[PDB]
Amino acid sequence: GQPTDAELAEMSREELVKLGGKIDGVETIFKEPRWPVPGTKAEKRTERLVAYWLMLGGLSGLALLLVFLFWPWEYQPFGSEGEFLYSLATPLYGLTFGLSILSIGIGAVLFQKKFIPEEISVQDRHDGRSPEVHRKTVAANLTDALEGSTLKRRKVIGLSLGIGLGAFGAGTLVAFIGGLIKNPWKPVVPTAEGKKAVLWTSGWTPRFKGETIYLARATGRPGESPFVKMRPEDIDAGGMETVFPWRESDGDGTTVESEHKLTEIAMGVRNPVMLIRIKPADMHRVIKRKGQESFNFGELFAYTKVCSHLGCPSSLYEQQTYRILCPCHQSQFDALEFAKPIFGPAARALAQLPITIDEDGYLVANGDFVEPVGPAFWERKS
Amino acid sequence: GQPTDAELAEMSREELVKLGGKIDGVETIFKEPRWPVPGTKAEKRTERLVAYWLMLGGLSGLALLLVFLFWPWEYQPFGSEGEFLYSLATPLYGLTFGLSILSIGIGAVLFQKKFIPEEISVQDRHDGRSPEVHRKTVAANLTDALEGSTLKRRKVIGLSLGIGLGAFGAGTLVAFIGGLIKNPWKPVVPTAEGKKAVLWTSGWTPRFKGETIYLARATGRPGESPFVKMRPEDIDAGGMETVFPWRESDGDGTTVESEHKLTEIAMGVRNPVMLIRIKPADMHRVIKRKGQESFNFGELFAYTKVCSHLGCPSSLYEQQTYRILCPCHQSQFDALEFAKPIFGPAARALAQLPITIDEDGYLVANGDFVEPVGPAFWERKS
Amino acid sequence: DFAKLAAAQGDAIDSRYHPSAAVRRQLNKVFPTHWSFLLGEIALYSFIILLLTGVWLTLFFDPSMAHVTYDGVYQPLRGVQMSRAYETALDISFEVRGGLFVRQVHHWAALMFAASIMVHLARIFFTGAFRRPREANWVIGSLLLILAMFEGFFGYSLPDDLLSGTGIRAALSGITMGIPVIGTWMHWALFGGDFPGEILIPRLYALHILLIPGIILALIGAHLALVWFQKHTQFPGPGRTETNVVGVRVMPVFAVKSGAFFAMITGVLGLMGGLLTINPIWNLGPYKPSQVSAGSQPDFYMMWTDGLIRLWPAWEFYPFGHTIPQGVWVAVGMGLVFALLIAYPFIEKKVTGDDAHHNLLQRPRDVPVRTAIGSMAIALYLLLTFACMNDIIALKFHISLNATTWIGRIGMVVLPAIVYFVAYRWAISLQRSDREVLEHGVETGIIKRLPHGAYVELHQPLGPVDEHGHPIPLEYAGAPLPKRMNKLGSGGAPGTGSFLFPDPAVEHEALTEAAHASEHKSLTALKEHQDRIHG
Amino acid sequence: KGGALSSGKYAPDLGDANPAQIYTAMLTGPQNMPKFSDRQLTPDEKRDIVAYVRESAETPSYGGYGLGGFGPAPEGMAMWIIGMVAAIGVAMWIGSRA
Numbered sequence A, B: 001g002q003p004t005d006a007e008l009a010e011m012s013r014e015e016l017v018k019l020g021g022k023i024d025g026v027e028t029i030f031k032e033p034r035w036p037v038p039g040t041k042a043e044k045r046t047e048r049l050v051a052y053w054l055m056l057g058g059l060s061g062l063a064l065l066l067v068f069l070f071w072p073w074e075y076q077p078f079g080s081e082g083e084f085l086y087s088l089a090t091p092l093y094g095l096t097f098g099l100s101i102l103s104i105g106i107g108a109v110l111f112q113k114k115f116i117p118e119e120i121s122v123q124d125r126h127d128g129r130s131p132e133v134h135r136k137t138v139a140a141n142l143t144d145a146l147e148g149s150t151l152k153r154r155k156v157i158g159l160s161l162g163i164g165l166g167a168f169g170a171g172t173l174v175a176f177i178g179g180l181i182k183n184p185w186k187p188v189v190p191t192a193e194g195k196k197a198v199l200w201t202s203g204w205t206p207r208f209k210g211e212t213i214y215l216a217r218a219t220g221r222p223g224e225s226p227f228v229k230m231r232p233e234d235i236d237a238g239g240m241e242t243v244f245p246w247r248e249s250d251g252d253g254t255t256v257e258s259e260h261k262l263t264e265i266a267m268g269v270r271n272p273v274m275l276i277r278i279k280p281a282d283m284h285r286v287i288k289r290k291g292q293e294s295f296n297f298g299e300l301f302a303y304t305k306v307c308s309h310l311g312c313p314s315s316l317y318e319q320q321t322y323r324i325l326c327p328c329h330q331s332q333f334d335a336l337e338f339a340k341p342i343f344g345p346a347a348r349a350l351a352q353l354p355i356t357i358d359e360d361g362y363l364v365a366n367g368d369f370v371e372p373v374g375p376a377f378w379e380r381k382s
Numbered sequence C: 001d002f003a004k005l006a007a008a009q010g011d012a013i014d015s016r017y018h019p020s021a022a023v024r025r026q027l028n029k030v031f032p033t034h035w036s037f038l039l040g041e042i043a044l045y046s047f048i049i050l051l052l053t054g055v056w057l058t059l060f061f062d063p064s065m066a067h068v069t070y071d072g073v074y075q076p077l078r079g080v081q082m083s084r085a086y087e088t089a090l091d092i093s094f095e096v097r098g099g100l101f102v103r104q105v106h107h108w109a110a111l112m113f114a115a116s117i118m119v120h121l122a123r124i125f126f127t128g129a130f131r132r133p134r135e136a137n138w139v140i141g142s143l144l145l146i147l148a149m150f151e152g153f154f155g156y157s158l159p160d161d162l163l164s165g166t167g168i169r170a171a172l173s174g175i176t177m178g179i180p181v182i183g184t185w186m187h188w189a190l191f192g193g194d195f196p197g198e199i200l201i202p203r204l205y206a207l208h209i210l211l212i213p214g215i216i217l218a219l220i221g222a223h224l225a226l227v228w229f230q231k232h233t234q235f236p237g238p239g240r241t242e243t244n245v246v247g248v249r250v251m252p253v254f255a256v257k258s259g260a261f262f263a264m265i266t267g268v269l270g271l272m273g274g275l276l277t278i279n280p281i282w283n284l285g286p287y288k289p290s291q292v293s294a295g296s297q298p299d300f301y302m303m304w305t306d307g308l309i310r311l312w313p314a315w316e317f318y319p320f321g322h323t324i325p326q327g328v329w330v331a332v333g334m335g336l337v338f339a340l341l342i343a344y345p346f347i348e349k350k351v352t353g354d355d356a357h358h359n360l361l362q363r364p365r366d367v368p369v370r371t372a373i374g375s376m377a378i379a380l381y382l383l384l385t386f387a388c389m390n391d392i393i394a395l396k397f398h399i400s401l402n403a404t405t406w407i408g409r410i411g412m413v414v415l416p417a418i419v420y421f422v423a424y425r426w427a428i429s430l431q432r433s434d435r436e437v438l439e440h441g442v443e444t445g446i447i448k449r450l451p452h453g454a455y456v457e458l459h460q461p462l463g464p465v466d467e468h469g470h471p472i473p474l475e476y477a478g479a480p481l482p483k484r485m486n487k488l489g490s491g492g493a494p495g496t497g498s499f500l501f502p503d504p505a506v507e508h509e510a511l512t513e514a515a516h517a518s519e520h521k522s523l524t525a526l527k528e529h530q531d532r533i534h535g
Numbered sequence D: 001k002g003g004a005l006s007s008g009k010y011a012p013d014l015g016d017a018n019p020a021q022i023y024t025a026m027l028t029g030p031q032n033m034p035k036f037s038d039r040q041l042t043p044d045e046k047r048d049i050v051a052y053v054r055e056s057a058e059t060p061s062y063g064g065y066g067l068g069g070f071g072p073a074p075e076g077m078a079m080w081i082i083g084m085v086a087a088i089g090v091a092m093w094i095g096s097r098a
Ligand SMILES: CC(C)=CCC/C(C)=C/CC/C(C)=C\CC/C(C)=C/CC/C(C)=C/CC/C(C)=C/CC/C(C)=C\CC/C(C)=C/CC/C(C)=C/CC1=C(C)C(=O)c2ccccc2C1=O
Pocket: C118, C119, C121, C122, C125, C126, C300, C301, C304, C337, C340, C341, C344, C373, C374, C375, C377, C378, C380, C381, C382, C385, D073, D076, D077, D080, D081, D084, D085, D088
């Protein structure tokens, strides 16, 4: 009821705590200690119990220091003297770490749940609808900074500052975004027609006229000749095989002008084509689609690996049912007819690459895909 | 003197502003408007003046939008139709940007200095030494959370929580730092003696025994044969020439197993060596140092390019005074005697590489440096 | 020199500043001690771990797409082309001491983060902690969930291991191209080129160290400020009216249990960061766009997204010379659900009519259609997730893969209806189960009636009793009423001695009489405060 | 580890796979797998693949329990019932209920 300035040094300490509650809004009803009877040994036993938890935390932190400094971790490659010790280097790290700080935390909260005195302190809120002084005073102060500063009486500043901040916000916003906005339909890649954009252009497209684009596999050799030229006798009946658009120009990976025309093939998304060799007992089940009747080679089909929608490689292939299955969303495609989606979230025919054999009998592409090969987007299908 | 709850809706707005000052501590003595006489045209002229500044800001923001969207920027290479327009693309960007927001800012502050009413509001502070209630109440509340929670009476928790947090802090701190701490003196690089550490090992060191380490120049060709083998007839009298430790193994840059044993030479710090060809009228001024009398080749000296202290390449060389000058701190070295610092912040002889000619007459290194070649550190000079 | 120097430095702090007012306002603030009010703290307490690990992961990770041969220690990847993001993520895994552990506890802290955000959203949804005063807090927490989801997706895609490289190809480049008008434009703005455009991984590293976690830290700061100053909500109970917060204060109790709960969350994350592998990127490969897994599934907080791709049944449109693909729908659909998850409190403020300042919570049985709409959303999430591991479910639990994605494709249409029915009537029957514990007592063991053969359950009443076999039936008050006399003071006095040896009997009498008197004093003080509120 | 396939069929785990069975598995493809022939993959390459799978399904999971081999779905389900159930259990042991 008063600030109590002179009688406060005489005031007891728990009365000062209740005075702080009263001056803040709280009352600590029922703040009683956990062990009101002294000298009992249940208190002493829970004392040494929380001491056991905190001492386990300290011992496991010291264990972290020891098994972090002094441990035979290194990537010892495989089955050898010292591989099982690396197999539980990180689990020993995590055991000591989690056990240390979890024992310290369970010790601190067991100290809260056994020795810190329980309280139910109720705090009187003042939430919602600030009193009649503060609302109207802030309203008067803001309307004095708006009405007294003589805006809303000068029309020309009131609109010219708006036009200024708006035009500068448009210029600064386009200065943020203008470095990002690339045109996807700027003609970038050289093609036989000229310069086409990137979505209508895989690496399967010819550059000038009919050039030998060999359907080369990727023998996964570390660097030296990763793309070996392909024959039809390599793939046999009921076989998926992944081909890439290698050329006679970008040869082996033994020159630095190669391995960048050559890893470009391995990094370009719309490059991989699976080379299906349908078992010839199942060539009467095939029905081709339009403009695509001669895109076989006997029983060699070349369907792309990048699927119909959302562009994952559909590198699952089922012979004896003839379904190109994708992994990312599990959308089947019919390998027999043309890669129409049998089932899945796809709705478009996965693209087919034409095949011929070269002089000397090597599998080459008979031109480009007739449709854009990757996932769908706006500018398509006309 | 009272909250004034009922008489506050009748209260005027500037009286509410002064009430907010009184309830916060402020008094707005002298808050008078800038234009107390109305209908004057000096007010109207400064109105249209700050309108001119804000309209210039809006016009220059619109100019930013125009010269950012519609401008012939691109890196047009050199002197050609369209190079001068790129030469002031970024200055036009900055002119429109800075002029726009600077005109808006000078308009807003001229609106402050011409129309917003000037005030000298004095705010009564309450700084320093919070009153007798708050100090002792917070002290009582913290000592009730320390004395009432029954720490400083339980010795075993009071030390075991300390040992727990300390051991876990040591383990977690070493888990932060332990990924960073590498041993610089782990033997890494293969050398003729065996495996030496990296500071005692440039690329000038022999790998097994005396091997031909050719003092090859760097003809700065983009990739194809960047290091051409060297003869003494190439460099002539009074000539600095930068040599690198090329070998017969890592040949031209036309293979991917090269250009990584070959750009390793161009990226290693302690590799560059200047090849001094002293004019032979000035060979009587030379005085060699210990273990280094036969490290010439007639008049070919090979001093390193990485300097004595703080490791910048000392690639400035003065014939007719014979001083290897470094650029980063301007420390001279005497090219005549041995690269002793004539003047500068260096105190150590810049290292000298031994020279012989190979069979077929090509400049090769006659071994390693006798001292560690780069900048100084702890483990040196014994 | 330990308390005198504390007093001297405290008077120095009170001399320089004047903090003690606005410190006493802080450490007398009351937080309620319900357990669910710790759940969102996990979303805080793992997030700090995500900085304390994540900063450590910044000073070893090198984002690039410059193609490097490995030439390191890991033997099944030697001489293989890899992006330098993947190469230095392999270096975090295998070179640096305790590196695989810090990146694993970082990924597990990301999982506990994006899962505790969902657990805490379930808390504040079903308990009704989002109406009138705290609806902006719901909005910034919902945006914080969105940023958590997108930022974690930028996270495990930041090394381009191909299990997540095909996740970028599916989600971030198949759906982004699959947007009708400005789809390809925002794709080629996001990547700067094609899908392995050379400035994707550094842009994700830029958005993923600072640019999204800066917004996440700003929203967590403003978010905990909205929880702090605007007082915390509470369940209604004994002494819990609309305009007070009962519980423990910050300084003696809540700070200790909050720091200890931070330490135990860090303990759970450390134990499961060591003992359990996560994202084994060396078992995975470098991202090359011609090779996939079979799983190819994202992290779980985003498995509802492309599971929604896996279940949306291939509906594409073809206007005059163009194509709307499937990926538009989920780009609508993720824009749909978020627009229902941000703007829900305004939705049911319009529907119900809750124009009142609510501070007391409502128990999730007390609000059956909102709990049932919520359980529709929970089970729809569980369906879209549990048909995103469609692949490995049909692998292990031997089901046709087509069959389980049809199970999902029908389940997202009929299982929210089933779980709405079960949830609504189950909430009403949970109401009726603790509205018969008031009209009757609390159930116990059976006595027979003496002169005839009957069987009464011997109900123990909760309030005042009348002169006969029925009490005065209490009214409901939004409280959890106890349904076991077990949880009342019945038989709750074991031996106080030890687990093996008893204490002497006078010490047992002193302890149980003191603890009984303290519990009696607790309910006495709370009951007289409750009478002080109304009387 | 295994993977799902189209209509009921599935790829099996390669852990319980004799190396000669792995070579003759890719050499003559039984059910729905392509027969990676003697000319499609050379015997150097096929010996090389069976070198990989007998030291990928045999090497231990470096750095903890291997929650399967495929990553994020077992890591999610072991986040919930191992990590998050323990987190909520700690949160209900610490806080009370009312
Ligand atoms: C609360 C609810 C979401 C209402 C919001 C309002 C609603 C109307 C907004 C619109 C939403 C509708 C239209 C579409 C649904 C889409 C969905 C909501 C996406 C948003 C993301 C987020 C909000 C998801 C919901 C929250 C989440 C499911 C709560 C967790 C469930 C419960 C309540 C927490 C306790 C569970 C805890 C104790 C562990 C128990 C163990 C059980 C088995 C965990 C279940 C489980 C889960 C939940 C996994 O995510 C998971 C992921 C990967 C592998 C396995 C699992 C798994 O087993």
